[PDB]
Amino acid sequence: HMRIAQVAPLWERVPPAYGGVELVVSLLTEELVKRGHEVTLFASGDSMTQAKLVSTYPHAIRLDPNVQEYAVYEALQLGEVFSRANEFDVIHSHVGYTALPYTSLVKTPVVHTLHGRFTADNERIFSQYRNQNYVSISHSQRQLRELNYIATVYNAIAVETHHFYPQPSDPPYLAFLGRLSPEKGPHHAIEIAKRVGIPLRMAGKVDRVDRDYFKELIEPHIDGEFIQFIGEADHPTKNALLGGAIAMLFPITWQEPFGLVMIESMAAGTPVVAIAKGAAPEVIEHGKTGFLCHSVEDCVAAVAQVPQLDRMACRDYVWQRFSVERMVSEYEAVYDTVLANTFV
């Protein structure tokens, strides 16, 4: 019953393959409008939404050879958001710190959902707008504390769209999903699959800056027989790619804000053996829906402890803490708190 604006990034599509935030903004927007609200999506033009689409570019900036300066369309989008700031009751910004200086100029309250790691550089712009409205996707992400965190909403997925696999494929294999960046540590997943004797079926995208790390540590160890690649899969693939696997290796070497590939694996009914970094303990129920490992050798030992877990429970676990009914209804109270706590 409010005028909401969801400012999504332009790198991807509301998303056929890669894209985490755009998937979260989708399940949020596609359900907010269903509850008699009034949302105006701010994303790309190829987006298939059920709200008033307002875009500055039709295609996605990532999969496009004709684009070169993304910061142009980054500033074009915000130029249309805060120009229409009088037509909105609350602005839900997902673009990150690029909207902080614009918030101190308009009148409409703006909420910022954090989606990345705080680095030694971006922590300065957050300290200059510490009292702004923030929303963390995990308690582990809340690292600055000095900011003004409104609440903590766990990212969710449409569980019914993920087909559930009870028993894995008869010839077992491991799994890896996500970008091939050092932030996800696929090189550990390569060794873990080889220290146990179970093949690995990887899947993800390789953008640049990852060109150096990929073809120096990941490409040398591809075979197609024991190590497959499948560069960037869609939804029906990762649905069955993780379903037929015994466990989704998630050996991160980076402060993971959340990790939607963990909750996606478990919907298909697959426990995630990940490193207890970032929001890994906040998602993985130890001994029930995965194993919170603390070393590379801990994952190898946990692999033998994977088949004894209940894969039918892993899906019912996502239906509890990681449901869209929990996430959207938890944002519906965040917007009211921001609107009720304004002037003093």
Ligand X SMILES: OC[C@H]1O[C@](CO)(O[C@H]2O[C@H](CO)[C@@H](O)[C@H](O)[C@H]2O)[C@@H](O)[C@@H]1O
**Binding site: residue ranges?**
18-19, 179, 184, 233, 238, 260-261, 264
CB nearer to ligand UDP: give 19 or 185. 19
Residue entry with tokens 């790390």: 213
C-alpha 288/C-alpha 310 separation (Å) is 7
Q: Could you tell me the sign of the dihedral formed by the alpha carbons of 7, 40, 234, 198, in that order? A: positive
200: partner contacted, choices ligand UDP, a copy of itself, ligand X, none (Cβ within 5-8 A by kind): none
Q: How far is the CB of 141 from ligand UDP (least distance, A)?
A: 11
Q: Is residue 257 involved in binding ligand X (CB under 6 A)? A: no
The H-or-E segment that residue 43 falls in is strand 38-43
Asked whether the beta carbons of 135 and 150 are under 8 A apart, the reply is yes
**Binding-residue pattern over the window 167 to 196 for ligand X, x denoting contact by CB under 6 A:** ------------x-----------------
| One-letter amino acid for residue 107 of the chain | K
Asked whether the beta carbons of 100 and 12 are under 8 A apart, the reply is no
**Binding-residue pattern over the window 245 to 264 for ligand UDP, x denoting contact by CB under 6 A:** -------------xxxx--x
Answer for which of 115, 238, 311, 315 binds ligand X (CB under 6 A) is 115
Q: Is residue 178 involved in binding ligand UDP (CB under 6 A)? A: yes
Q: How far is the CB of 168 from ligand X (least distance, A)?
A: 26
The residues, any chain, with a CB within 8 Å of residue 339's CB and separated by 6 or more, are 2, 89, 90, 109
| Residue least distant from ligand X (Cβ) | 20
Answer for which of 21, 25, 39, 157 binds ligand X (CB under 6 A) is 21
Judged by CB under 8 A, the chain residues 107 through 166 that form the site for a copy of itself are 119-122, 124-125, 128-129
Q: Is residue 100 involved in binding a copy of itself (CB under 8 A)? A: yes
The CA distances from residue 91 to 307, 309, 341, in Å, are: 45, 43, 15
Q: How far is the CB of 300 from a copy of itself (least distance, A)?
A: 34
The residues, any chain, with a CB within 8 Å of residue 246's CB and separated by 6 or more, are 168, 172, 173, 174, 175, 198, 270, 303, 306, 307
Where do runs of H (alpha helix) occur along 33-111? 70-81, 100-103
Structure-token pair, residue 204: 């993800």
User: Contact positions toward ligand X, by CB under 6 A?
Assistant: 9, 11-12, 19-22, 96, 115, 179
User: Contact positions toward a copy of itself, by CB under 8 A?
Assistant: 56, 66-69, 71-73, 75-76, 78-79, 82-83, 97-98, 100-102, 104-106, 119-122, 124-125, 128-129
User: Contact positions toward ligand UDP, by CB under 6 A?
Assistant: 17-20, 23, 177-179, 203-205, 232-233, 238, 258-261, 264
